[PDB]
Structure formats: C-alpha cells, structure tokens
C-alpha cells in the first residue's frame, strides 16, 4: 500500500529510537544484532522496566531475557523468540521481529498504551 505495514512499524519503532542511543533501527535484522533494540523499544512504554542507561552491549544474553522477561511480566507478551536462539543466531528475521512487534503492538492498542498523546 502507499503507506505499508513494515514502514508503519519502522517509522514507529524508530520514533522511539530517538529517545535512546547506540541504537539505530535501519533494519529489523542487522540493526537488532545488538539486542539493545528489544530492550530499548520496551523501555519506552515501561519506565519501571529497567535502567536502559545501565545496560551495555556486553550483556546481550541478559538483554534478550530481560526484554522478554520484562515484557512478559508487564505485558505477558508472546514467546515467538528465544534468547538462546537470538544469542546463537545473532541475526533475527524481519518476519520474526515484525510478527513479535505485531502481537505486542496489538496488546499496546488494547492497553491504550499507544494512544498516550495525540499529535
């Protein structure tokens, strides 16, 4: 479509990347090899989550588990991705992140999280 799906998420996800640093969402795979994206994106809607400024790219394993363990306890998100796999692959799939974000996106809509402030 003239708009596009991934573009919507990309535009959106990126919009939250401005707040955070060391993170650049120019892709859904390579730009995610740091795992810093999953944690950073969540930290946007959940402050009690964790101190994103206290995390480093050194502890990726924890970043993945954290991003998931945090989103799960707070949003009971999906379990489409496995920390170990992410760690081993070090290369996610645009469909995986997209699909994950998809489910997550929807949860935010119901929760009314995405509709925090109008333009």
Swiss-Prot record:
Tissue: Widely expressed, with highest expression in skeletal muscles (at protein level). Within striated muscles, significantly more expressed in soleus muscle compared with plantaris muscle or white vastus (at protein level). 30-40% lower expression in females than in males (at protein level). Expressed in type 2a fibers, but not detected in fast twitch type 2b muscle white vastus nor in oxidative type I/b heart muscle (at protein level). Expressed within myometrial cells of the uterus, as well as in the endometrial layer. In the aorta, confined to smooth muscle cells.
Cytoplasm in keyword set: yes
BP term (GO), one: muscle organ morphogenesis
Keywords for the protein's UniProt record, in alphabetical order: Calmodulin-binding, Coiled coil, Cytoplasm, Muscle protein, Nucleus, Phosphoprotein
Residue stretches making up the Calponin-homology (CH) domain: 6-109
Domain of life, source organism: Eukaryota
Residue span of region Calmodulin-binding: 101-119
Induction info: Significantly reduced by exercise in smooth and in skeletal muscles.
Keyword Oxidoreductase: no
GO cellular component: contractile muscle fiber; cytoplasm; I band; M band; nucleus
Location in the cell: Cytoplasm, Myofibril, Sarcomere, I band; Cytoplasm, Myofibril, Sarcomere, M line; Nucleus
Disruption phenotype: Male mutant mice perform better than wild type in exercise stress test after endurance training. Females do not differ significantly during these tests. Even in the absence of endurance exercise, mutant mice exhibit muscle fiber adaptation, i.e. more type 2a fibers and lower levels of type 1b fibers. Endothelium-dependent vasorelaxation of the aorta is enhanced and responses to beta-adrenergic constriction are reduced. Expression of PPP1R12A is 30-40-fold higher in mutant mice than in wild-type littermates and exhibits a steady decline as the animals become sexually mature (at protein level).
A GO term, aspect molecular function: myosin phosphatase regulator activity
Subunit structure, as described in the record: Interacts with PPP1R12A.
Entry similarity comment: Belongs to the smoothelin family.
Functional description taken from the UniProt entry: Plays a role in the regulation of contractile properties of both striated and smooth muscles. When unphosphorylated, may inhibit myosin dephosphorylation.
Name by which UniProt lists this protein: Smoothelin-like protein 1
Gene: Smtnl1
């Amino acid at each position: 479509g003239p708009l596009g799906s991934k573009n919507m998420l990309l535009e959106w996800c990126r919009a939250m990347t401005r707040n955070y640093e060391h993170v650049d969402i120019q892709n859904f795979s390579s730009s995610w090899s740091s795992g810093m994206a999953f944690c950073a994106l969540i930290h946007k809607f959940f402050p009690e989550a964790f101190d994103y400024a206290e995390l480093d790219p050194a502890k990726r394993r924890h970043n993945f588990t954290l991003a998931f363990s945090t989103a799960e306890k707070l949003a009971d998100c999906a379990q489409l991705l496995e920390v170990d796999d992410m760690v081993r692959l070090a290369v996610p799939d645009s469909k995986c992140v997209y699909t994950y974000i998809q489910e997550l996106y929807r949860s935010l809509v119901q929760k009314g999280l995405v509709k925090t402030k109008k333009k």
